[PDB]
Design a protein around this ligand. Structure first.
Ligand SMILES: *[C@@H]1O[C@H](CO)[C@@H](O[C@@H]2O[C@H](CO)[C@@H](O)[C@H](O)[C@H]2NC(C)=O)[C@H](O)[C@H]1NC(C)=O
Ligand SMILES: *[C@@H]1O[C@H](CO)[C@@H](O[C@@H]2O[C@H](CO)[C@@H](O)[C@H](O)[C@H]2NC(C)=O)[C@H](O)[C@H]1NC(C)=O
Ligand SMILES: *[C@@H]1O[C@H](CO)[C@@H](O[C@@H]2O[C@H](CO)[C@@H](O)[C@H](O)[C@H]2NC(C)=O)[C@H](O)[C@H]1NC(C)=O
Ligand SMILES: *[C@@H]1O[C@H](CO)[C@@H](O)[C@H](O)[C@H]1NC(C)=O
Ligand SMILES: [Ca+2]
Length: 641
């Protein structure tokens, strides 16, 4: 009936911000080669204040060279003694975010780790000091090379924590003058971190924030008891259609109302990875075509705005927040300077389903809601109104100011289903706009890369999405014809998060491709035992990369070749002998059309008219038999979709 908003009785919890995750894994892969001005426009829609999603927080993966959901991300230490703070794109992304918003909050979290940290086991807790040293080097590098202050560091994404590790990490941060960096744990479930904090005073002293994943809007009694800030440190992960925006809208309010969570962070920031990879199109917006420049400013962007443009980290929730009588919810926040923001959501069940968890049905229906401002809020006489309707839709439209001149400090709204209203004293709101970008276009049906770039802007060639292993630009001064190549640089399996393949692989192109010719120069670095391949019709990647099928043309340094149906090499289409050895350059060609494939070695037919499964479709790919050095040059693909 009448909902009282008031601060006379005091405040609720401090609001810590809304944000998103870039990483876990390679979710921002295709954004780096967007041409201008589009790359810059996309970044403005995400980070520019008073414009688009206007995010308060950016969480990034600390790449560990393993597969982490939609690809691998490169580490700053591939090997013992190796340090390089210029790989991948997270450094770049953080800098672009800070340029737009100097106050944005930065977080880092490992999903996987380089294998050498395990000292012969696939476990990062064998040598606590060693793993801590690795993580802290990342934070130092961020500051020293990019002028980035990392605000929060996590433990091990969705994997067990070790209490002694957390203590050693704190001691190691302090020893290196990073007393200011805070620790969030354990990026998994509420337990066992929450009970652990209550039983161990020394642990409690070193953990600043309990971050839970996909909590379904709820927390647990032990977490409330700890008195720690509680964050949904990973949530969302739904296709960014109107339904995903509904999900986002609902949890943004209800994480606080139901779960005392004062921050929510969406996986992921922007869908810049091939859509046929796991959880495709699950970013706040979509930017998956750097070749065309086409991007889509999706609904979730504006749902974010309804909160982020009108609140900042450090505002407070009022004690008076709740559910509306006929379904939906409201929160309200102040900054202790006389501003007030109120956010109302009426998302219907059927249009707000998240993947984790699925909620039993609940009812929403038309209702009137009356709000009365008591206490220090009584003196407000004017509120700006912003409105979104989801599903033919209207996004972030500024309505007529509402006036509370009558002296009643009260007002009423007609609420229907699937709406959001933001009512705020702030006058800074803006529906940012750039002109439409170029239309959508398939990946180019003819495509070439000779990797001849002397000072590349990024450490890897555009469009190649590593799914196991790490491929990088490589300069070899001691050769002329292959001075500039692409090289696979892992020499041992990472401490994996996902089930990485046993073979390294990078995919590229159009998952729809069905008939195609792939050609590449290849170079095996390991005598006797080394091997490389080129492939087409590769149908799965990311978390599922082990499952990839397609047509794989392998050559080995012992003078053999195989053609397989799967990355695992369990199904043979053909095999035989070849004039192939280590440390020599060969040109491989692979032609697939309908039921039949053929392979060429240096332009000469090696096998032809081999029967392959059809129909079938997928990416082109290159890679290596195991985690071993190998080089690639002059890649070409001609394909029909
Ligand atoms: C966490 O939030 C809950 C509500 O989600 C608060 O628990 C009580 O909630 C009921 C019903 O909504 C209110 O009537 C009470 O006023 C709340 N209890 C208290 C402590 O006043 C609870 O306050 C929050 N817990 C915290 C902040 O630790
Ligand atoms: C509402 O919020 C605005 C923005 O923070 C406040 O205006 C700022 O107030 C601070 C200190 O109070 C000043 O130093 C800044 O110059 C102001 N900035 C802007 C954007 O004007 C304002 O005081 C708050 N109160 C209301 C109701 O406007
Ligand atoms: C890929 O190649 C196959 C085989 O050539 C194509 O399928 C043939 O298409 C022709 C003309 O449309 C038909 O008359 C044949 O009967 C088809 N062969 C088989 C075995 O299906 C297929 O259409 C090509 N796909 C694309 C998109 O280029
Ligand atoms: C939802 O609630 C409204 C209002 O009470 C009611 O008329 C409608 O039938 C309900 N729908 C379901 C399926 O519960
Ligand atoms: Ca080259």
């Amino acid at each position: 009936g009448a909902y009282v908003l008031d601060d006379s009785d005091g405040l609720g919890r401090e609001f810590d911000g809304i944000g998103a995750v870039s990483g876990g894994g390679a979710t921002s892969r295709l954004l780096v080669n967007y041409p201008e001005p589009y790359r810059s426009e996309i970044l403005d829609y995400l980070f520019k204040p008073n414009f688009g999603a206007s995010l308060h927080i950016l969480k990034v993966e600390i790449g560990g060279d393993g597969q982490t959901t939609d690809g691998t991300e490169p580490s700053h230490m591939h090997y013992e003694l190796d340090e390089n703070y210029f790989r991948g794109y997270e450094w770049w992304l953080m800098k672009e975010a800070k340029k737009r918003n100097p106050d944005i909050i930065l977080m880092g979290l490992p999903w996987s780790f380089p294998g050498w940290l395990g000292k012969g086991f696939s476990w990062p807790y064998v040598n606590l000091q060693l793993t801590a040293y690795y993580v802290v080097r990342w934070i130092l590098g961020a500051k020293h090379y990019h002028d980035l202050d990392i605000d929060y560091i996590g433990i091990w994404n969705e994997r067990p924590f070790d209490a002694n590790y957390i203590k050693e990490l704190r001691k190691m941060l302090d020893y290196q003058g990073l007393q200011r960096v805070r620790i969030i744990a354990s990026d998994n479930l509420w337990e066992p971190i929450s009970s652990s904090l209550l039983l161990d005073q020394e642990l409690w002293k070193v953990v600043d924030v309990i971050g839970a994943h996909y909590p379904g809007t709820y927390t647990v009694w032990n977490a409330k008891m700890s008195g720690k800030k509680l964050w949904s440190s990973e949530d969302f992960s739904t296709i960014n259609s109107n339904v995903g925006a509904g999900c986002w809208s609902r949890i943004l309010n209800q994480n606080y109302i139901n779960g005392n969570m004062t921050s929510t962070i969406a996986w992921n920031l922007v869908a810049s990875y091939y859509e046929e990879l796991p959880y495709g199109r699950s970013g706040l917006m979509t930017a998956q075509e750097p070749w065309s420049g086409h991007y889509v400013v999706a609904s979730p962007i504006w749902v974010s705005a309804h909160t982020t443009q009108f609140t900042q980290p450090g505002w407070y929730y009022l004690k008076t927040v709740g559910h509306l009588e006929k379904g939906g919810s409201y929160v309200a926040l102040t900054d202790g300077l006389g501003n007030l923001t109120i956010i109302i959501e009426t998302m219907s069940h059927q249009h707000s389903m998240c993947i984790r968890p699925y909620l039993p049905y609940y009812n929403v229906s038309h209702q009137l809601a009356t709000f009365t401002l008591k206490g220090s809020l009584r003196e407000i006489q004017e509120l700006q109104v912003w409105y979104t309707k989801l599903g033919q839709r209207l996004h972030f439209k500024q309505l007529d100011t509402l006036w509370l001149l009558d002296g009643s400090g009260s007002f009423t709204l007609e609420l229907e289903e699937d709406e959001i209203f933001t009512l705020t004293t702030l006058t800074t709101g803006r529906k940012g706009s750039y002109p439409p970008p170029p239309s959508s276009k398939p990946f180019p049906t003819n495509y070439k890369d000779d990797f001849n770039v002397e000072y590349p802007l990024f450490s890897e060639a555009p469009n190649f999405a590593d799914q196991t292993g790490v491929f990088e630009y490589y300069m070899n001064n001691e050769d002329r014809e292959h001075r500039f190549t692409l090289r696979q640089v892992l020499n041992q399996r990472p401490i994996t998060w996902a089930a990485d393949a046993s073979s390294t692989i990078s995919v590229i192109g159009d998952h729809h491709w069905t008939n195609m010719t792939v050609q590449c120069d290849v170079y095996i670095e390991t005598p006797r035992s080394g091997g490389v391949f080129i492939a087409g019709r590769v149908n799965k990647g990311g978390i599922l990369i082990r499952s990839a099928t397609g047509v794989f043309f392998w050559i080995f340094a012992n003078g053999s070749y195989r053609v397989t149906a799967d990355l695992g090499g369990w199904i043979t289409y053909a095999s035989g002998h070849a004039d192939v050895t280590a440390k020599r350059w060969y040109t491989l060609t692979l032609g697939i059309k309908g039921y039949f494939a053929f392979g060429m070695l240096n332009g000469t037919i090696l096998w032809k008219n081999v029967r392959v499964k059809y129909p079938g479709h997928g990416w082109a790919a290159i890679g290596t038999h195991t985690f071993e050095f190998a080089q690639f040059d002059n890649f070409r693909v001609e394909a029909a979709r």
